[PDB]
Amino acid sequence: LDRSEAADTWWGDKDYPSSVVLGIGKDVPSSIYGVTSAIAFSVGAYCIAQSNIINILSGSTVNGFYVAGALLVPYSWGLHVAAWIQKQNGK
Amino acid sequence: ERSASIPFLKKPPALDGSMIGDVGFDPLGFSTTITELGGDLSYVREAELMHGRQAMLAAVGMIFPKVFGKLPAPWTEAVSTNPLEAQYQLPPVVLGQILISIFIAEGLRSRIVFGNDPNYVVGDHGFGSNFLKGKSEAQIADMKLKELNNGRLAMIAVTGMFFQISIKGNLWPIIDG
Amino acid sequence: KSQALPFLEAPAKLDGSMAGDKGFDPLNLAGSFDINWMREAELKHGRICMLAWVGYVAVDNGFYVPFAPHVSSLAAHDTAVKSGQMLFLLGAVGVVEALSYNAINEMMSGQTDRRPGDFSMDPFKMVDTPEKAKSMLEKEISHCRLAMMAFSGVVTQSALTGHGFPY
Amino acid sequence: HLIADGRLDHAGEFIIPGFGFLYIAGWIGWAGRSYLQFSKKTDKPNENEIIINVPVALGMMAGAFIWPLAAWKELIDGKLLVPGDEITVSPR
Amino acid sequence: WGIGHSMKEILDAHVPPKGRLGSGHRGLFETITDSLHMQLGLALASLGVATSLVAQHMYALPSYAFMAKDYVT
Amino acid sequence: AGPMYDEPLAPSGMGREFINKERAPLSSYVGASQELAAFPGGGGKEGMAPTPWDPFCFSELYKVSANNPDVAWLRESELKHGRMAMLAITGVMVQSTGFHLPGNAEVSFANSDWVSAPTTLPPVVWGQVLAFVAIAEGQTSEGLFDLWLGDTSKREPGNLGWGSGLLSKDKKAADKMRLKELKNGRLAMLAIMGVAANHFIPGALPGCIY
């Protein structure tokens, strides 16, 4: 990737960042971002709790579909940050 | 704009039909990145011809030891007819002397490979070039394309052969055991 | 106005330009993300489901290759995996799928005028002109959607109860 | 063995001596700072630093007993810190 | 291909609100990709930290057989 | 070039003029208390003293740096702590009498130990309470970084919009109600922290019953 092939994303003067920083998610509405963030956080917390807390994680038997979904907690964080960004962008 | 081999992908920018066997087949873009780097495709084309010729020779010499025969057997009686076992069964004398023969050939080739000869044609080492004197340039292109296609086929064939002998121990339509 | 949901209007991106455009997008997913990727994904799912449906139906109505295990299509996956042919087909489709990585990149970047779900397979020039292309694309996408739903029903019925071509 | 983590069962090891030293050290620093503030206003600050005006220096040493309140008052009044662009700084 | 990230874009748009960290990380991509000494310094710092880590971890968690009783090594 | 003795380290054109502008004073906030100014001579009326109380001058610490919060933020935090402490002291007082919700097989709300009362509940029951508090404190908080640097524009300190219409239209009566809020909140803060201190170390609050 060359230095020229890069959009101007700097937003220090502005109060909020442009939607270009979201990449492919620039056009995603804020309501969809927020509701998906809530669903993702709930599902990931449920998966981690059922993997480690409710059942103590045994090496012989780990579900895998609970290991997946545990990654949605960072995804939920990103989704709610993007929800805020889209809310301030009015998009 | 579109490759002639893969008609749903863009033509490779480096390839432009100015080479033998050019059908725009470069999904990854080796020629493209080489041209961005600055080098030419002469090295890759000559390496292609080298590999194709070696694969053709290897394919014939691997279907042979057990087809028409393992020589008159002065010393090769002990060498196994299995090609993958014969390589670890050549004797020291023959092994080293084949080694030095191919070494001197490759060392002679290396200078014209990495030299700055402007008149050098890719795949033109002068070995058996006398037959090309009679033929015309269209015929020359056709014959070079035939050579390239045969080498291209043999590169993949051989590769199969080797694996079939490794995992099954025999080819399907020939070499029953 | 959206025809599927006549109580609201269709999004900006559903404009007829694409085949099978009934103005159906209650969630604005194709407004949220590029629609060419959506159409290519829809087409790919539909072709896989069409071939899967007809293959399931034939294997259940006796259609096997020489040197094949005579097994119902439900356990055909496991038996073919054990035989190893499954991995050969995996490589065969993986070649086309990596070429599809390249094709999708070119389509989205605009380096080529590639339509979604297009690999330039027209031996019989079935769509060499615009109106033929529109008609045949609408008919395909209809078949894609219908076979997607039909195969979901089939495989599930098969995994739930019974067997045979009917279920 | 002295335990210095914050537990009040062993306060006398570090916490009480710590506050005592902090008070004494702030006393010393405040006396020095206040004497410097005086000595600069004088006609000959350079000679006032090497020949101490003891009559007022003892006054500053005494008055520094209440330094935590005096320091807070000067901070609130903006007289503890010199602003940032009134102090030399080298070429960055 | 298209998927991925642009480090220039990431650095440029990572700037906290109200100019807490000045203009943020604008221009750092240019300086790092132009200056080999900054890259060398970052690599050396990371490798020194890694060397300290292996030194601290080999003795605490020996991985090779019978090395624990080999005191000189 | 502003109220602060130093220019903010935030740069020009990226926040400096936003931080270094004029800010409202402590005297323009409804927090004065007649009780402190309850002695012969100088004194106040209507429950308010003529001047506010700030021996440590935390209100005007912004002039030293913009790291320190503004009086808008401090009033927001004061009203938040007061409201939370009022609910907390009412809750402990009601719970210690033994009154509790009906309950069932799954949940048992019978526990007079306010310290360990949440521990008795199932994970879901207190989970809902904490989740509601987490969502609301976080949704209602918009423009709080603006109240820190001082821009009481978008957000008034303590005005979440919940029942703000019931405030009287007269300025005097509105300020009277706000002062009643602040006084009850501060009393509840002292009460709840005193009960907690009494629990942790006995004898901290001699008038305790819990």
Ligand code: CLA
């Ligand atoms: C291909 C690589 C590989 C292989 C062969 C194994 C094999 C094993 N692991 Mg696993 N493991 C791996 C990678 C791998 N691991 C990775 C990357 C991690 C994260 C650091 C772990 C962490 C881990 C832990 C903590 C434990 C095991 C254990 C096990 C055993 C049972 C696991 C099981 O039944 O999962 C079956 C699961 C599946 C068939 C589906 C898995 C699909 C995943 C979730 C896809 C997504 C991956 C993700 C993006 C990668 C980043 C990691 C992310 C989760 C943070 C087995 C010996 C257990 C063990 O041996 O205990 C004595 C055990 O306790 N593994």
Ligand SMILES: CC(=O)O[C@H]1CC(C)(C)C(=C=C/C(C)=C/C=C/C(C)=C/C=C/C=C(C)/C=C/C=C(\C)C(=O)C[C@@]23O[C@]2(C)C[C@@H](O)CC3(C)C)[C@](C)(O)C1
């Ligand atoms: C002094 C001297 O000599 O001068 C020379 C000079 C000069 C110019 C060099 C000359 C020349 C020409 C030369 C050297 C010509 C050499 C030609 C040669 C030696 C050409 C082999 C091709 C082989 C191919 C394509 C193999 C395909 C192989 C394939 C596709 C397969 O069979 C596939 C398969 O096997 C698998 C993979 C697995 C099995 O289950 C199934 C089968 C069997 C089907 C001269 C003029 O003649 C003389």
Ligand SMILES: CC1=C(/C=C/C(C)=C/C=C/C(C)=C/C=C/C=C(C)/C=C/C=C(C)/C=C/C2=C(C)CCCC2(C)C)C(C)(C)CCC1
């Ligand atoms: C001068 C200069 C330079 C240089 C620099 C350097 C040399 C640096 C270094 C640095 C360093 C060398 C650093 C380091 C750091 C570190 C850190 C920061 C760490 C962290 C950690 C953590 C975070 C951890 C955590 C954890 C975990 C994870 C687990 C366990 C527990 C704990 C907690 C421990 C350069 C070149 C750049 C250029 C410019 C200038």
Ligand SMILES: CC1=C(/C=C/C(C)=C/C=C/C(C)=C\C=C\C=C(C)\C=C\C=C(C)\C=C\C2=C(C)CCCC2(C)C)C(C)(C)CCC1
């Ligand atoms: C408790 C405790 C602890 C802890 C501690 C800590 C954690 C601390 C911190 C600290 C800190 C973190 C601090 C900071 C600071 C800052 C600043 C910024 C300062 C300033 C100062 C000044 C400015 C001064 C001045 C003066 C005065 C006032 C007096 C004298 C003179 C002078 C001038 C010097 C421990 C564990 C150890 C244990 C023991 C106990």
